[PDB]
Amino acid sequence: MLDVNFFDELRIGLATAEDIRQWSYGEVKKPETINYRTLKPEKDGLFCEKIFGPTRDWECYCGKYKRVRFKGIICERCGVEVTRAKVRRERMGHIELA
Amino acid sequence: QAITRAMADQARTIRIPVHMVEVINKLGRIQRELLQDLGREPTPEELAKEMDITPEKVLEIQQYAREPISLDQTIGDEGDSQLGDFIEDSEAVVAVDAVSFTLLQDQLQSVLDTLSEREAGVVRLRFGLTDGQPRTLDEIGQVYGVTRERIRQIESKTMSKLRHPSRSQVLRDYL
Amino acid sequence: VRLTFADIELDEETHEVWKAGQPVSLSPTEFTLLRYFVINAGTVLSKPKILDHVWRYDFGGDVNVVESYVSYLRRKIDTGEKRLLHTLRGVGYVLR
Amino acid sequence: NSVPGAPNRVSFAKLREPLEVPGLLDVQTDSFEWLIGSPRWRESAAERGDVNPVGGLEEVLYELSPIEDFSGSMSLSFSDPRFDDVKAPVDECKDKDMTYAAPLFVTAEFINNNTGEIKSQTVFMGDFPMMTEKGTFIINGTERVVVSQLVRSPGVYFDETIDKSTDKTLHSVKVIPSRGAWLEFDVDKRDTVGVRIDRKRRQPVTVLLKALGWTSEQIVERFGFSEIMRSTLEKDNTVGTDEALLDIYRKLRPGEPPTKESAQTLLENLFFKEKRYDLARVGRYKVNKKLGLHVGEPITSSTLTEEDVVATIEYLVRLHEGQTTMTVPGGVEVPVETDDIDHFGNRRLRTVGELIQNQIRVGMSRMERVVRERMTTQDVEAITPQTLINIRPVVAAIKEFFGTSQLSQFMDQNNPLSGLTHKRRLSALGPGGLSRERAGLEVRDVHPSHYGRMCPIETPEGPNIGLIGSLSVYARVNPFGFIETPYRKVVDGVVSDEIVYLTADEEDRHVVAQANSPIDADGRFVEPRVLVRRKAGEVEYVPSSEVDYMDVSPRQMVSVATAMIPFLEHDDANRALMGANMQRQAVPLVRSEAPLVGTGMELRAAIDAGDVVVAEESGVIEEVSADYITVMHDNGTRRTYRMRKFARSNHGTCANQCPIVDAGDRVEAGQVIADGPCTDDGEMALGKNLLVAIMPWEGHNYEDAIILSNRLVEEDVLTSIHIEEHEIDARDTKLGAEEITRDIPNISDEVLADLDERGIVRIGAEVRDGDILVGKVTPKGETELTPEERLLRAIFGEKAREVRDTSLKVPHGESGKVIGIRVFSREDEDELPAGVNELVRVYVAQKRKISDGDKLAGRHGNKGVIGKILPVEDMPFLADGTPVDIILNTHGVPRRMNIGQILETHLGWCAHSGWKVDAAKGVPDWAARLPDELLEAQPNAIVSTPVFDGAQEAELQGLLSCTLPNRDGDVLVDADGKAMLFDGRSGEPFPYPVTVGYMYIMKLHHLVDDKIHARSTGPYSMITQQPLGGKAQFGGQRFGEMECWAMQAYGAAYTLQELLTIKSDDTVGRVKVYEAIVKGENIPEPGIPESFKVLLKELQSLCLNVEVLSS
Amino acid sequence: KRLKVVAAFQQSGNSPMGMVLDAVPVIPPELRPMVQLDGGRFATSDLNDLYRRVINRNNRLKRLIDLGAPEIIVNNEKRMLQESVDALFDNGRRGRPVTGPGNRPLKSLSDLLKGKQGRFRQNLLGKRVDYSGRSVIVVGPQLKLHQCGLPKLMALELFKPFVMKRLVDLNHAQNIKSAKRMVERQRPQVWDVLE
Ligand SMILES: [Zn+2]
């Protein structure tokens, strides 16, 4: 589970709601993708920084932090964790069906 | 009312406020009326006359009204590959400038070591190389037990001797 | 090598600005702001651009400083009938 | 010759054809003329079928009109579709990316019957794109061709099948109408007859007949012999018209309660109402001809009819009973037999006019819907036709066809042959037809009905083999879209001069003779039994007094490109196919010498391709320059032909045009004035005549490779001009406007020397890879300024450089001169796409010389790349000292059965050397039938060998015998066509004579410069980090599953790991491996590919708990 | 045939509750990118449309149930939501597929796994690859068996890091930036070191 090419086994099974919520780093509830004017992802949308990671490297939703020093500290105004934007290629969320 | 509000709020991939959807639909409707009436398409200035707003905002509305296309629709004349197979990765590491960056880092280290230790440290903490923060004159003063004016003079002297032809020529090619 | 835009005439070497033959003395901050505006005529400059270039990077204060300086420059050189240093809300400032 | 300026071309043809080749663009021009309704087409319809002359637009208008409301007290109608003068000339439209179009107007009549009101208005229907005089459309500055497609004609088709359970012979029929619901009948394994309608697999014919207002008594009275379905009727288990109607309703429309009237109205509405079901006029004609319903009546009521359905059922049952002839009540006697689906009497050709008419039909259907809605909504007595009509759907539909439809393609113009072959081409793909995923081998086969309709040789070679062909040179399109071909008639065993055009329908009812039959100059054939084609496509011998038709000429069965292959009959079918397919890929050279040996087709091909200027009115020539030619006509007026020079074609080849006339000579109407790209003196010339030897040489021509002398490089015998265009646009953006300016940050000065003050490279300034063509600088502002940039601007004094440089740079791997520049801007009124304020296109030319890796080919499918360019001294040279120009291997001929190329070689040497047959004591035996004026030919003569009435082997041998010497008394080439060569390397004479001659060799558009690629590190895709693909991006080769299998087969594991991980997906591995290789340390261990992680997250998003276990 | 699944459920630790779904996951945004191509036009990954449809149906359903509505309305909404989820995973497995502009089906999740053009085969087993080239083939009759003649330009492009490092070793360039420039302009001091 560490991505070191040392894999003793690879297992597949049916996924439960608990496992889905464990994978999810948040809940997406708004069918909004990108702002039509500022071209920035909306909050709680399908691209939300708070749920999936910051769009730009080492930057918050408003740019309150713009330095590599802030490691793993979430913005109190936005809620985004300051890390590499490549986490958006790994971070996944979920929706709750009525 | 419910149907139109829902259309404005949900029909587009990129959400457009109803206040802007209304103007987009009105512009399109009256522009097609004008085309039908006049026999040719109306120009942006003519349409701005009816919008009672300026042609710059007319053009901004026009370019706002555009919608996205699918990254997976077949682009080829036959069905062979998707449009997503033609789009670059802008954010990807180019993998040749990284080596240039690290080697320029080493060269900057060497050039800074050419200078005196005091001036080298002043410039390092002044431009944020050891850490991420380029500190202020007060901070370098409190860490070096020296007045901020003397810091300004030491920075100017350091910059003057750093302008020296060999350092300038050595760093110039790295651009 | 003389920086120009219609009415405003800025010369770096002699360090003062003219309004079609009308010089006025400006503060250093506002002078750098005006200079690095005029060299970018017709182009939008955002607040981080402004703060990082005219001010130093380590400016840890709040942004309205540039707001006040643009007000200064407007009441100083825009004081003519026409408005040149226009503002794009949430984006920045352009002289045009 | 029948062409005023034709160069003399002596021919070996024995027989004289009765009729000359038709206008080769008729297939497109006549169709578009029919669609528009020009007076020329008016006269054509008047002289042929004047009973109902109606154009396509008039027909669709008359069909749509009148549009009615629910009340019926007011209505709308259309009439008089008229055009207007075109917007701009073709050259202008191509120059400024316009569309060669014309306004269209319709005289709308709005009528009101409650009180009486007539409103007449000339409503503007839109701007219809027009067709140029050369048969192409101009759309946004591009030349597009709409290829005619092949579709099964709508109608009724019978087929027979074997059940294979009991070997019972089953028969089925399908009524397939265009824009309708299917009708089906069949006989089952048992005696039951099925009428599965609209894919509902029930209902024997009893219920349908009963619902059609018929009773069991009427059924048994009319249909008595049919014991099979008489038993089926006895097992109806449903009596009563109402019962049958409710059964049909509850089957076809589940979930809704049947009513007494809904059943009847639905059964009528499904087929008998033209609003929902109509065979086209072609479909109605096909059904009428098949069932013998109406033979002296005009075509109307295109919808199906009840008596037509009952006639279909009667035909099916009579066929299953083994009958051979039926007479429908009130109808003519007709044969009873099954129908072939691929017979060209059933496979119709949708042409440009038909496709355009169908798209207009869709647009006007949307028109009618919208106008009916608005005419209901708006208040009455205040409504106008202008307020009713809203042309946006119509214009959108015509645009949506003319762009982005696979039946509308770029008119490839490597040469006039390629253009003329893209036109007059028959495709079988696109909407309404089968696709490559659907093609059957029976479809791809050559049907015997193809003879004289569609060529069986000329066709693409790849996966779409057989789905694309070309019209035969003599073919024509019937008014109903069926391909018909001319043929002469024989009466009393004597061939008349009367020519009738015959469709594949009537050809089976005739016995057509052969083109090259031994005619007696009176009408009779010398032998009683002649070889002919009978009804079923069979070929047999027949007494001469029984045939009734004969071919107009040889080459009737062949296309236009293939007809330009000399000695075609001596070439194998597939090699001739390859030759015909490569005829249209030859690039235009700088000279285009006419071939020494050819056919008579080149003159007409060059004339009809439209790439050669022709004198439209006879007159003298007043003055001539390199760009314009002015002619002084007889009747006072003078005309000026402007001549296009160095214009880039759609495929990046020059389209230079050159005058071939003097300053005082007179010209007649139709004569060539100025030759085009691939033409000489007005006849097509796609290559050069090269002196060839056919011996293998040192292994450099091993396996289809080709060797050439260096004088072909030196004299520019094989060289081409390749013009390339590059585009860049300055467009507005959120931060301002990009500007094209020579001021570009952090650039040197020598690279700015070729840039003028405008910011664009000077015309004539030569350019190479990596240079700037357009200095276009974009507003970016500033980004994260790394500490090192600040340090640099501090140390040296670098300025703000606030802007970014997205300048136009020449793409990697080419160079050359700059021809010209076009600049578009909004400040000059020029119409531009919204958001773009400046557009720049830059044209770059390369004079590409011949080099190794380039592909050469003959006209006989003998292609090959250039193995080696050899110095002129080191080449085999005849005793005269002339070196050979090109060497081809001798192992490639006998294996592929293209001896015709050797025949061409011999005849080319004879035509190059000249000849004189000594008629001292009469002519020799072989020359008895050889035509006069051919017994004696000067050196460097030109000869034409028509494809099947060609030069016989005996004639060629006799010509080779007398081959008058070149300069002194020397016959280098002996009686059998061979010659003695001297080896240019060792000097000793070659031990045995080898054949030498002159062969026509052409350079194909497969130059190595356009096919060389290499990649070390470039772009990567987004979703997965794989490299890109193709020369447009930076590429990266595909290591496929087969290559993976080969790597595992070698047992080589580490290189497989590296080919999959640190070259394609492992991002950290890529960066680290580049750093390691530059620094000089060994390659690091590969990591985990990114594509596998993408797959893991993808499977996780499908509700699959997939994970990795470490112990 | 029924036991071969019932016993499979019984033997292991999985629970047949997994057939039905109370929550669905969402693919990471970079796996379904939305990017602005040249000319200002925008491009989406065609999966966001399915996700948006599902979100819209779910939000409308929850609004309906929290506001109070007839059971037939609520059931129609529930059927729409179920069809949306089925379209998300498999577009076209049930009924006609959901189609976008141009009357073309939207590609669903499983649509990027199945098929020769799918991920497993077109992207995972096979792979586009760096340090590679192609060109036409000519005969080299004077070569040896273990030998192949390579174009000098394409060889230079292929061996680019190797040759740049070696040429900065030979001091023909001072740094790799200068080396890259002389590689791009193909200066004569690169051909001899290429061999
Ligand atoms: Zn923040």
TrEMBL record, chain B:
Annotated spans, Sigma-70 factor domain-4: 111-164
| Annotated region described as Sigma-70 factor domain-3, given as residue ranges | 22-98
The UniProt subunit note reads as follows: Interacts transiently with the RNA polymerase catalytic core.
Give the family per the record. Belongs to the sigma-70 factor family. RpoD/SigA subfamily.
What job does the chain carry out? Sigma factors are initiation factors that promote the attachment of RNA polymerase to specific initiation sites and are then released. This sigma factor is the primary sigma factor during exponential growth.
Q: Which residues of the full protein are shown?
A: 353 to 527 of 528
Originating species: Mycobacterium tuberculosis
The source's domain of life comes to Bacteria
List the coiled-coil residues: none
> Where does the protein end up?
Cytoplasm
Q: Which residues form the RNA polymerase sigma-70 domain?
A: 136-162
What name does this protein carry? Answer: RNA polymerase sigma factor SigA
DNA-binding region (UniProt annotation): 137-156
UniProtKB/TrEMBL annotation, chain C:
Q: Which residues bind DNA?
A: 1-96
Could you tell me the superkingdom of the organism this chain comes from?
Answer: Bacteria
**UniProt domain OmpR/PhoB-type: residue ranges:** 1-96
Signal peptide segment:
none
Q: What is this protein called?
A: DNA-binding response regulator
According to its UniProt entry, this protein's organism is: Mycobacterium tuberculosis
Name the gene for this chain: phoP
Which part of the entire protein is covered? 149 to 244 of 247
